[PDB]
């Protein structure tokens, strides 16, 4: 379903790992969720849906401005 990815975006490693699918930023999990229209949000950008988990990870990197995620 959601496509795996693993790349550096603005100095952060962003991953979509298939087992169960999880998004990670510098090895910490980004809580994400899919809306029924197929769009994605995250706990870092909750109110602004984007098209894919990669797009959600990139939006989170912009928002974080270098900051690490903490556990949820």
């Amino acid at each position: 379903g959601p496509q795996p990815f693993d790349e550096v975006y603005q100095g952060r490693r962003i991953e979509g790992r298939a087992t169960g699918y999880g998004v990670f930023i510098d090895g910490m999990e980004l809580h994400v969720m899919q809306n029924v229209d197929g769009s994605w949000i995250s706990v870092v950008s909750h109110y602004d849906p984007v098209a894919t988990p990669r797009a959600a990870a990139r939006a989170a990197v912009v928002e974080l401005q270098g900051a690490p995620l903490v556990p949820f």
Partner: protein, 273 residues
């Protein structure tokens, strides 16, 4: 309890309101609300149990949450009432809401850090404890990159929608609730969270005191919708799985139903509706 438009508050009312917020923060009670809200943000899904968001109970849930919050503020200072932010009118970063004697302004460019007002991290009075990342300081990007708040005509287009909510009772619904919440259509409530930026745009959005004023205005818009459509009831009205029907109790309180919350006037009135 009379909830006033924030734009009409006096210097004295602002001082008491922000002093009450700072005391509620110090007591730990403030962060309990952030924790509870984050729990429903993470928990509520389109396909599963949904109570606080993306569901018909978005409106009564937030009404009850705000009543709880305002009663906690009143235990600090019984003169205080939650004000509302009409973002259709007070629609720029230059609004009096964002002055240093009220909520303070936007975040600086480097790190989004709020640098003025009572909630600026440098005060030591607003540590961000309930967090999704390492940053312990309030951040905002008010209108960042040219984002626009909803207009009065866009609000009126949603107030005109006579149906409260529709199956499938989630982010895909047509009707008033989902268009007010903003997962479909012109987008009122969600877009305002995004416009403030910083923590307000995240899953720990009640870290920004503006959360309460935005939700007090969304709550007022529900009252205005009821006045426009007095015969439009809350739906659904029974037997809907994973959804709070009219006469079911809501978590976390488990002792109040949407039916008990449709009339706000048992709890507060508005300066004007």
């Amino acid at each position: 309890t009379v909830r006033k438009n924030q734009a009409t508050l006096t210097a004295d009312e602002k001082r008491r309101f922000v002093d009450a917020l700072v005391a509620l923060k110090r007591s730990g009670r403030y962060d309990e609300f952030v924790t509870t809200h984050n729990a429903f943000i993470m928990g509520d899904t389109d396909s599963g149990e949904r109570t606080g968001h993306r569901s018909p109970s978005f409106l009564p849930w937030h009404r009850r949450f705000l009543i709880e919050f305002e009663q906690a503020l009143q235990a600090v200072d019984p003169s205080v009432a939650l004000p509302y932010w009409d973002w259709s009118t007070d629609r720029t970063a230059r609004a009096s809401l964002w002055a240093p004697d009220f909520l303070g302004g936007s975040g600086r460019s480097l790190d989004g850090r709020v640098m003025d007002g009572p909630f600026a991290a440098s005060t030591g009075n607003w540590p961000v404890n309930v967090r999704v990342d390492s940053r312990t300081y309030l951040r905002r990007t008010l209108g960042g990159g040219g984002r626009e708040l909803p207009t009065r005509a866009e609000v009126d287009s949603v107030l005109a929608m006579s149906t409260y909510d529709m199956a499938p009772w989630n982010s895909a619904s047509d009707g008033f609730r989902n268009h007010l919440e903003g997962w479909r259509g012109v987008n009122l409530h969600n877009r305002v969270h995004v416009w403030v930026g910083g923590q307000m745009a995240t899953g720990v959005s009640p870290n920004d005191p503006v959360f309460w004023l935005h939700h007090a205005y969304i709550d007022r818009l529900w009252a205005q919708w009821q006045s426009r459509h007095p015969g439009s009831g809350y739906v659904p009205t029974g037997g809907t799985p994973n959804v709070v029907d009219l006469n079911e109790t809501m978590k976390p309180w488990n002792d109040v139903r949407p039916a008990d919350l449709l009339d706000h006037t048992a709890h507060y009135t508005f300066d004007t509706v």
